[PDB]
Amino acid sequence: AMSGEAPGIRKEMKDVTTKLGEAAQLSCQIVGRPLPDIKWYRFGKELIQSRKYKMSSDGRTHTLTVMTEEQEDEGVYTCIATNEVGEVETSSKLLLQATPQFHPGYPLKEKYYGAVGSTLRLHVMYIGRPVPAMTWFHGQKLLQNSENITIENTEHYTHLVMKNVQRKTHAGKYKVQLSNVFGTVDAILDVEIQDK
């Protein structure tokens, strides 16, 4: 006809939390005449329906189902509703839940070796949502950022860098600890310094 109604949001998308590895339903209501066509977006790219991204619409309620497998599934999801009259946009975030766990796929070795006088970097990949409190220990001493020690913590890893390693000062056992509301986990790394 002469007139159609551009898609209108009845219920906007809301933030959703789901256990990592389980299904996540992101839903919203948008109404238009003609009925709106739905597209889902992720990092500026259109999501195409698959087994991982299931898409449901009855013309009013639009739901995206994400079968979470990895931490990277978390984040922004955008639903765009369109018709000849116009288009609307709505976005929300997916929050994952996972007990702190050292990343399988990047197994930690028992012993690590640092050349004398060189910098040693311990790069530990982990799985944990929400991002866990991360802590490093050398013996019974809690590691803190300083001139020769730096610790970069990310939602994907905890990175310890030690400058100018010497056997008397840097050799020994190290403990990396990850903790969140769900639980805690730790690993012990045996560091040895080799003259070279």
Short mmCIF file of N, CA, C and O in Angstrom, two decimals, residues 72-119:
data_model
loop_
_atom_site.label_atom_id
_atom_site.label_comp_id
_atom_site.label_asym_id
_atom_site.label_seq_id
_atom_site.Cartn_x
_atom_site.Cartn_y
_atom_site.Cartn_z
N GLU A 72 35.21 -16.92 23.09
CA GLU A 72 35.05 -15.89 22.09
C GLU A 72 33.61 -15.63 21.66
O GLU A 72 33.34 -14.69 20.97
N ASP A 73 32.70 -16.52 22.02
CA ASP A 73 31.29 -16.44 21.74
C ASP A 73 30.63 -15.41 22.58
O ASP A 73 29.54 -15.06 22.32
N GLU A 74 31.30 -14.95 23.61
CA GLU A 74 30.77 -13.96 24.46
C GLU A 74 30.74 -12.63 23.74
O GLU A 74 31.32 -12.48 22.72
N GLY A 75 30.02 -11.66 24.26
CA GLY A 75 30.01 -10.40 23.58
C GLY A 75 28.80 -9.91 22.90
O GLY A 75 27.75 -10.36 23.13
N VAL A 76 28.97 -8.91 22.05
CA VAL A 76 27.87 -8.29 21.32
C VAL A 76 27.22 -9.04 20.17
O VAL A 76 27.88 -9.58 19.32
N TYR A 77 25.90 -9.03 20.17
CA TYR A 77 25.10 -9.64 19.12
C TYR A 77 24.08 -8.60 18.70
O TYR A 77 23.46 -7.97 19.54
N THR A 78 23.92 -8.41 17.41
CA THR A 78 22.99 -7.42 16.90
C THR A 78 21.94 -7.97 15.96
O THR A 78 22.24 -8.68 15.03
N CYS A 79 20.69 -7.62 16.23
CA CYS A 79 19.57 -8.05 15.41
C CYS A 79 19.06 -6.87 14.62
O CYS A 79 18.73 -5.85 15.18
N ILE A 80 18.99 -7.01 13.30
CA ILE A 80 18.48 -5.93 12.47
C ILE A 80 17.21 -6.33 11.75
O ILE A 80 17.18 -7.28 11.00
N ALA A 81 16.15 -5.57 11.97
CA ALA A 81 14.87 -5.85 11.37
C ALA A 81 14.59 -4.88 10.24
O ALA A 81 14.69 -3.68 10.41
N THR A 82 14.25 -5.41 9.08
CA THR A 82 13.99 -4.56 7.93
C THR A 82 12.73 -4.88 7.13
O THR A 82 12.25 -6.00 7.10
N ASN A 83 12.22 -3.84 6.48
CA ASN A 83 11.05 -3.90 5.62
C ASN A 83 11.17 -2.73 4.65
O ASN A 83 12.10 -1.95 4.76
N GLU A 84 10.28 -2.60 3.67
CA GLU A 84 10.42 -1.50 2.71
C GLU A 84 10.39 -0.14 3.37
O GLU A 84 11.13 0.75 2.99
N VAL A 85 9.52 0.04 4.36
CA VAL A 85 9.41 1.31 5.04
C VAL A 85 10.67 1.76 5.78
O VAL A 85 11.00 2.94 5.76
N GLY A 86 11.37 0.84 6.43
CA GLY A 86 12.57 1.19 7.16
C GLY A 86 13.18 0.06 7.95
O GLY A 86 12.74 -1.06 7.86
N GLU A 87 14.21 0.36 8.73
CA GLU A 87 14.85 -0.67 9.53
C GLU A 87 15.23 -0.21 10.94
O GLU A 87 15.50 0.96 11.15
N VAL A 88 15.25 -1.14 11.89
CA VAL A 88 15.61 -0.84 13.27
C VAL A 88 16.73 -1.76 13.70
O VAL A 88 16.93 -2.81 13.12
N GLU A 89 17.47 -1.34 14.71
CA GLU A 89 18.58 -2.13 15.22
C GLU A 89 18.55 -2.28 16.74
O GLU A 89 18.18 -1.36 17.46
N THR A 90 18.93 -3.46 17.23
CA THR A 90 18.96 -3.71 18.66
C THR A 90 20.09 -4.68 19.02
O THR A 90 20.29 -5.70 18.34
N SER A 91 20.82 -4.36 20.08
CA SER A 91 21.98 -5.15 20.46
C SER A 91 22.02 -5.44 21.96
O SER A 91 21.52 -4.67 22.77
N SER A 92 22.63 -6.57 22.31
CA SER A 92 22.84 -6.95 23.70
C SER A 92 24.05 -7.87 23.79
O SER A 92 24.58 -8.29 22.76
N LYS A 93 24.49 -8.17 25.00
CA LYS A 93 25.69 -8.97 25.18
C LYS A 93 25.42 -10.34 25.79
O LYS A 93 24.46 -10.53 26.53
N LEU A 94 26.29 -11.29 25.46
CA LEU A 94 26.21 -12.63 26.03
C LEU A 94 27.31 -12.81 27.07
O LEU A 94 28.49 -12.68 26.76
N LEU A 95 26.91 -13.10 28.30
CA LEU A 95 27.87 -13.32 29.38
C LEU A 95 28.00 -14.81 29.66
O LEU A 95 27.01 -15.50 29.88
N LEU A 96 29.23 -15.31 29.64
CA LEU A 96 29.48 -16.73 29.85
C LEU A 96 29.72 -17.05 31.32
O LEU A 96 30.07 -16.18 32.11
N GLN A 97 29.52 -18.32 31.67
CA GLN A 97 29.81 -18.81 33.01
C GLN A 97 30.69 -20.05 32.92
O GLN A 97 30.35 -21.02 32.25
N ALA A 98 31.84 -20.00 33.59
CA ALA A 98 32.77 -21.12 33.57
C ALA A 98 33.71 -21.07 34.77
O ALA A 98 34.31 -20.03 35.06
N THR A 99 33.83 -22.19 35.46
CA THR A 99 34.75 -22.29 36.58
C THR A 99 36.17 -22.19 36.04
O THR A 99 36.48 -22.78 35.01
N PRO A 100 37.02 -21.42 36.73
CA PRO A 100 38.41 -21.23 36.29
C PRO A 100 39.07 -22.56 35.94
O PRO A 100 38.96 -23.53 36.70
N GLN A 101 39.73 -22.61 34.80
CA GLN A 101 40.33 -23.83 34.29
C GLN A 101 41.47 -23.50 33.34
O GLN A 101 41.31 -22.70 32.42
N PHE A 102 42.63 -24.11 33.57
CA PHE A 102 43.76 -23.90 32.66
C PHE A 102 43.44 -24.50 31.30
O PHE A 102 42.91 -25.61 31.19
N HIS A 103 43.76 -23.74 30.25
CA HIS A 103 43.33 -24.07 28.90
C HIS A 103 43.89 -25.39 28.38
O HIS A 103 45.10 -25.53 28.20
N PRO A 104 43.00 -26.37 28.14
CA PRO A 104 43.38 -27.57 27.40
C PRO A 104 43.53 -27.23 25.92
O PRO A 104 42.61 -26.65 25.33
N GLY A 105 44.67 -27.57 25.34
CA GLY A 105 45.00 -27.12 24.00
C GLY A 105 46.28 -26.31 24.05
O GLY A 105 46.94 -26.08 23.04
N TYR A 106 46.62 -25.89 25.26
CA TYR A 106 47.88 -25.22 25.53
C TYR A 106 48.44 -25.76 26.84
O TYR A 106 48.64 -25.00 27.79
N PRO A 107 48.68 -27.08 26.90
CA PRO A 107 49.12 -27.75 28.12
C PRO A 107 50.34 -27.10 28.74
O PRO A 107 51.26 -26.70 28.02
N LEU A 108 50.35 -26.99 30.06
CA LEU A 108 51.49 -26.45 30.79
C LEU A 108 52.52 -27.55 31.06
O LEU A 108 52.16 -28.65 31.47
N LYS A 109 53.79 -27.25 30.82
CA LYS A 109 54.86 -28.19 31.13
C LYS A 109 55.27 -28.07 32.59
O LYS A 109 54.98 -27.07 33.24
N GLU A 110 55.95 -29.09 33.11
CA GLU A 110 56.35 -29.10 34.51
C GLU A 110 57.45 -28.08 34.78
O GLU A 110 57.43 -27.38 35.78
N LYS A 111 58.42 -28.02 33.87
CA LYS A 111 59.59 -27.17 34.05
C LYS A 111 59.75 -26.19 32.89
O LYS A 111 59.52 -26.54 31.73
N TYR A 112 60.16 -24.97 33.21
CA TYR A 112 60.46 -23.98 32.18
C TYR A 112 61.87 -23.44 32.38
O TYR A 112 62.32 -23.28 33.51
N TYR A 113 62.55 -23.17 31.27
CA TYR A 113 63.96 -22.79 31.33
C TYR A 113 64.22 -21.39 30.78
O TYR A 113 63.84 -21.07 29.66
N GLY A 114 64.90 -20.57 31.57
CA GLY A 114 65.25 -19.23 31.15
C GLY A 114 66.75 -19.03 31.09
O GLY A 114 67.45 -19.38 32.02
N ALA A 115 67.24 -18.47 29.99
CA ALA A 115 68.67 -18.22 29.84
C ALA A 115 69.12 -17.13 30.80
O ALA A 115 68.39 -16.16 31.02
N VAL A 116 70.30 -17.27 31.38
CA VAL A 116 70.77 -16.26 32.32
C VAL A 116 70.96 -14.91 31.65
O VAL A 116 71.57 -14.81 30.59
N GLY A 117 70.43 -13.89 32.30
CA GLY A 117 70.52 -12.53 31.82
C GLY A 117 69.45 -12.15 30.81
O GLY A 117 69.33 -10.99 30.45
N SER A 118 68.66 -13.12 30.38
CA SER A 118 67.60 -12.85 29.43
C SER A 118 66.24 -12.69 30.11
O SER A 118 66.10 -12.97 31.30
N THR A 119 65.26 -12.24 29.34
CA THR A 119 63.90 -12.10 29.85
C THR A 119 63.14 -13.41 29.69
O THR A 119 63.24 -14.07 28.65
#
